[PDB]
Amino acid sequence: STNLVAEPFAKLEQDFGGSIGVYAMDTGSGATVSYRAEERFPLCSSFKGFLAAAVLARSQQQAGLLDTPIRYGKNALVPWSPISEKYLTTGMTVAELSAAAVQYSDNAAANLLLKELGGPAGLTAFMRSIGDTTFRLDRWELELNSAIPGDARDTSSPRAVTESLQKLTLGSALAAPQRQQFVDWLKGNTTGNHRIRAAVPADWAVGDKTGTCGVYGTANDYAVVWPTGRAPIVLAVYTRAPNKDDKHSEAVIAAAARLALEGL
Numbered sequence: 001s002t003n004l005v006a007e008p009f010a011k012l013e014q015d016f017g018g019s020i021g022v023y024a025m026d027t028g029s030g031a032t033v034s035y036r037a038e039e040r041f042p043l044c045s046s047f048k049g050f051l052a053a054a055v056l057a058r059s060q061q062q063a064g065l066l067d068t069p070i071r072y073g074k075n076a077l078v079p080w081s082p083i084s085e086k087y088l089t090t091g092m093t094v095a096e097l098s099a100a101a102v103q104y105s106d107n108a109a110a111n112l113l114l115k116e117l118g119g120p121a122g123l124t125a126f127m128r129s130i131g132d133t134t135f136r137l138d139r140w141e142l143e144l145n146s147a148i149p150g151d152a153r154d155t156s157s158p159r160a161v162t163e164s165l166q167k168l169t170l171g172s173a174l175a176a177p178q179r180q181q182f183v184d185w186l187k188g189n190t191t192g193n194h195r196i197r198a199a200v201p202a203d204w205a206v207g208d209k210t211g212t213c214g215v216y217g218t219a220n221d222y223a224v225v226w227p228t229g230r231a232p233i234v235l236a237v238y239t240r241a242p243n244k245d246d247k248h249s250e251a252v253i254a255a256a257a258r259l260a261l262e263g264l
């Protein structure tokens with residue numbers, strides 16, 4: 001990946017104080033926009049999108065998986081598990097857990113689904129199975145948010161995120177019903193209104209999955225975007241910063257997303 005008009009990104013990055021990672025593709029034209037697209041960034045909660053897709057893939061082999069109820073315990077409830085906490089007394093189905101992980105970044109739901117898939121190694125294996133050799137999940141919630149500079153655990157690249165997202169939402173990695181369900185969950189996300197969505201024209205449909213580590217200025221968003229009458233755009237925007245106390249910036253994510261969309 002290159003970019004011969006990178007200076008707007010470089011200037012945004014300098015103003016941010018950290019590192020910005022962008023990859024965007026117009027699936028109609030094959031045009032792309034790149035900045036640190038090959039460099040590793042922490043996934044934070046953005047892994048939860050791929051987790052839901054992995055669950056949907058498994059559902060293609062196990063009938064009834066999505067409808068299976070899980071009666072989880074109180075000590076499954078790690079901080080920021082708003083749906084799992086609300087539904088603790090009833091339990092939740094696998095489908096509901098997937099929707100909560102995607103649309104609310106629900107931490108307990110993600111861990112419960114990781115367990116059904118064989119842990120971080122199992123999700124990493126799923127990603128390897130669709131041709132993604134960059135993605136690695138190593139730890140569970142909340143430990144995977146440590147976001148330590150240079151630590152390759154729980155990281156991917158903006159390009160590999162975008163490519164895998166395209167395969168699962170638009171390609172043939174998932175069967176058609178599973179694929180539509182994944183897209184529908186992403187379109188229903190509630191956590192992303194100040195990130196990529198804030199850069200997309202009001203009349204374009206969007207689904208997205210955010211991540212926020214809470215340390216080292218580290219936060220992100222990826223999305224499928226449907227321009228009027230066109231094939232969709234798929235993009236990923238990731239950030240990090242060198243100091244543990246550096247604040248993440250949603251505005252920086254939105255601005256980088258806008259630069260990518262304008263570049264296309």
Ligand SMILES: C[C@H](CS)C(=O)NCB(O)O
Nearest residue numbers: 044045080211212213214
């Ligand atoms: C620790 C942090 C507080 S916002 C969190 O729960 N992130 C979920 B994710 O992995 O982004």
